[PDB]
Amino acid sequence: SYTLENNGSVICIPNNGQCFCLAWLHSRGTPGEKIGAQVCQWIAFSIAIALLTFYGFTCGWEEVYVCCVEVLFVTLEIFKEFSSPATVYLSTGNHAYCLRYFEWLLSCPVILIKLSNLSGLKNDYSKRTMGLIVSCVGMIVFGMAAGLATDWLKWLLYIVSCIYGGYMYFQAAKCYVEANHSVPKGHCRMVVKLMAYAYFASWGSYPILWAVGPEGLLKLSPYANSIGHSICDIIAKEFWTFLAHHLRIKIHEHILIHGDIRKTTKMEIGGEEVEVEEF
Amino acid sequence: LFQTSYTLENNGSVICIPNNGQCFCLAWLHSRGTPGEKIGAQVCQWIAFSIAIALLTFYGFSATCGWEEVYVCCVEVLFVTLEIFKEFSSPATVYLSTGNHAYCLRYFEWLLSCPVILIKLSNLSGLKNDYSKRTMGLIVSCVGMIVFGMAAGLATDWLKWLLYIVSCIYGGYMYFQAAKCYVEANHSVPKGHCRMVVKLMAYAYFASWGSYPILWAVGPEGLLKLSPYANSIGHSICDIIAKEFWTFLAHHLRIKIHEHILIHGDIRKTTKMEIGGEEVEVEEF
Ligand SMILES: CCCCCCCC/C=C\CCCCCCCC(=O)OC[C@H](O)CO
Ligand SMILES: CCCCCCCC/C=C\CCCCCCCC(=O)OC[C@H](O)CO
Ligand SMILES: CCCCCCCC/C=C\CCCCCCCC(=O)OC[C@H](O)CO
Ligand SMILES: CCCCCCCC/C=C\CCCCCCCC(=O)OC[C@H](O)CO
Ligand SMILES: CCCCCCCC/C=C\CCCCCCCC(=O)OC[C@H](O)CO
């Protein structure tokens, strides 16, 4: 595709108008790693289609939107993952997977909008809901910039992203505590706890996968990193929204057979005191 | 950085560069604008820089009442500073293997500021716990709008304009939701000075927000009429209106409503209104 010159110090290429960089030609992963990515992609696709069909087509727009985004994303990844602009190849020699950051920006705020109102629909939206959304957006923005950036700048932006993420994780964790005391005593408290465990395990893995992936320490290949992101998406997008959809109807069914008995009880969760709904 | 040194050798159809692991593309060496446009860009940058700092000093630093104005102007201070010193360095400006370039620093600016503006717009009146369901429709539609706009700038050829249209569909739903907020804000603030402020915020919002898709389609990520410097002039003027003039009025409005209630007392009446063909409950003074 090119030609050497001198003693390897000069390289010549055709003047055809196509950008050239040897650093863009690195391998994508091993044959076994590719097969695993294909397997997990089609599982994530097939589960989303099923969950879309289960949800239907309003109350419950969040789950639909998240799963619609998963279908679109996983479909574009199956067919045109390493094509620009799904994967961007920068003049600095590196590359970034912009298709994935776009996915996060569409779905992560919605998941958090669902989290701030897990229990019986309290239309009064708090200042906490805004704190989740704003911190999540800032987190992904500085994450995406760190993926495009290079050398020390990359890790400076990465750290800024972790600061945003911390506030988001903090606010998200306070939701799960308030959500627990706000749902019926039996089966509903377990689902909230299972949703919390699924949320932190999946959402906690992305920074780890980022730092060792092809946009960080270059340990994991793109194909390998794809397997890891597919599994997190299955838990964060599909398993979690199913539990959220399930939690709603179980709360509705409990109310029609028990009523709507609620007392305003005040307690402390984070560094403050909050009054929450109690059955 | 890319390669700026090369030699057009052979008949001109074969080019040679030093083999130093440095990416090379002639399409990246395009002009950034004229000396006049360069100056006009720098004038508008330092104006936005200075107004943002004055507003930040004016609002003062008190999850507080008025966090939106501070965050927006903080995003302004960070964006303009990075644009003044490192506008055309990567990743502020990204140069793709497809020959095109994109101003990612601007999309980052939008993603940080545009939702917060709409969060403020969702609650233009006083008090708290006023967001509800329109807010989410504003945020989700605004975010999707920027996301598909960013993808459009990264892409080339027909895909770019496909992504552009999808962004406009997102934007139209957002613009629609936004207009109903101003209609409801009019009927929920004191019938004197505050409604003139709300109407002025509405004009500034649409005139500034409506100009970004026009600048985009015509600038260096579109039909290539406006240079990067020229396109910077237009964006700075829109930012001064969208982020600085608009948040000052939002900050001013909140004072005027609080000063009104402090002397007039809190009196209200719930009115079942038709906003965009539906039953909306808007409380009036
Ligand atoms: C009810 C609505 C139904 C909607 C339709 C649902 C279709 C499910 C498709 C595949 C499932 C997984 C089967 C495994 C697919 C292997 C595909 C393959 O050959 O590999 C991918 C290829 O390499 C990439 O270009
Ligand atoms: C080369 C230089 C590149 C630029 C590098 C400098 C960037 C500094 C900006 C912000 C610091 C991080 C502040 C993170 C703000 C999070 C606070 C927040 O918004 O959350 C509020 C909370 O959730 C409700 O209480
Ligand atoms: C190798 C390990 C395989 C792990 C694969 C994890 C896939 C999770 C995907 C989506 C979540 C869907 C969860 C919903 C599953 C149905 C369970 C259910 O709720 O059924 C209720 C009914 O009462 C009982 O018959
Ligand atoms: C309570 C705290 C009160 C704080 C009070 C505010 C302090 C302002 C500080 C720094 C601004 C100085 C930077 C001013 C930038 C203007 C530069 C300019 O005018 O443009 C010329 C250009 O730099 C030619 O290269
Ligand atoms: C809070 C309100 C304060 C608002 C601010 C008050 C107005 C500042 C004056 C002029 C605008 C910018 C100054 C124009 C100078 C730009 C620098 C420049 O033009 O230098 C280019 C030169 O060609 C390099 O070689």
Numbering used by the authors:
A (entry chain A): 58 to 114, 120 to 341
B (entry chain B): 54 to 115, 119 to 341
What's the paper's own text on this?
ChRs mediate phototaxis in green algae and are exceptionally popular in neurosciences, where they are used to manipulate neuronal activity with light to study multiple aspects of brain function ranging from synaptic plasticity to network analysis. More recently, a ChR from Chlamydomonas noctigama (Chrimson) was identified as the variant with the most red-shifted absorption peak at 590 nm, which is more than 40 nm further red-shifted than all other ChRs. Therefore, Chrimson represents one of the most promising ChRs for both basic neuroscientific research and medical applications.
As the expression level of wild-type Chrimson is very low in insect cells, we tested two Chrimson variants in which the extracellular N-terminal sequence was replaced by either the corresponding sequence of the Chloromonas subdivisa channelrhodopsin (CsChrimson) or the N-terminal sequence of CrChR1 (C1Chrimson). The two protomers in the asymmetric unit form a dimer, with each protomer composed of the extracellular N-terminal domain, 7TM helix bundle and the C-terminal β-hairpin loop region. The CrChR1-derived N-terminal residues mediate the crystal packing contacts between the layers in the lipidic cubic phase crystal and facilitate the dimeric interaction by forming the inter-protomeric β-sheet and three disulfide bonds. Although Chrimson is distantly related to the CrChRs (about 50% sequence identity over transmembrane region), the overall structure of Chrimson superimposes well with those of C1C2. In the current ground state structure of Chrimson, the ion-conducting pore is closed by three constriction sites that restrict ion permeation, on the intracellular side (inner gate), at the middle of the membrane (central gate), and on the extracellular side (outer gate). In Chrimson, direct hydrogen bonding between Glu139, Tyr159, and Ser288 interconnects TM2, TM3, and TM7 and constitutes the outer gate constriction. The crystals of Chrimson were obtained under low pH conditions, and the blue color of the crystals indicates that the current structure represents its red light-absorbing (protonated) state.
